[PDB]
């Protein structure tokens, strides 16, 4: 017996699958969205999820630190044309899901983090 192919190292790849919305993004179910915070706490509690019914956009799962006890958000994203306005005091109009996750951060008074899984 005698063989052995397999591909080059192939170890030079890189994806950022990050289309239309940004890598931090992730598929998952709210019931997920949540423990993959506790879970990951290192890798931020800032995370996106597909909503899934309702209105137009993508929700924004937050874990902050909230009288000591532990409680999550859920914010909500309107699609007005080629923009998307943020359910916040004032509608702040951005070009790409990618400012949403910015404006958050500058928001907020403290420096958040974005939630990632590779």
């Known amino acids: ?14 994806a950022r699958r990050a289309l239309e919305t940004p890598s931090c993004f992730l598929k998952v179910s709210r019931l997920e969205a949540q423990l993959l915070l506790e879970r990951y706490p290192e ?3 800032l995370l996106l999820r ?5 209105a137009d956009g993508v ?4 874990r902050q630190m909230h009288n000591g006890t532990h409680v999550v958000r859920h914010y909500k994203v309107k699609r007005e044309g080629p923009k998307y306005v943020i359910d916040v005091e004032q509608p702040f109009s951005c070009t790409s899901l990618d400012a949403v996750v910015n404006y958050f951060v500058s928001h907020t008074k403290k ?7 590779d």
């Open 50 to 54: 597909p909503s899934g019914d309702g």
């Open 1 to 14: 017996g005698s063989s052995g192919s397999s591909g080059e190292v192939l170890a030079k790849e890189e």
């Open 59 to 62: 929700s924004v799962t937050t």
């Open 111 to 117: 420096a958040l983090v974005p939630f990632l899984l």
């Open 43 to 45: 890798c931020g509690n």
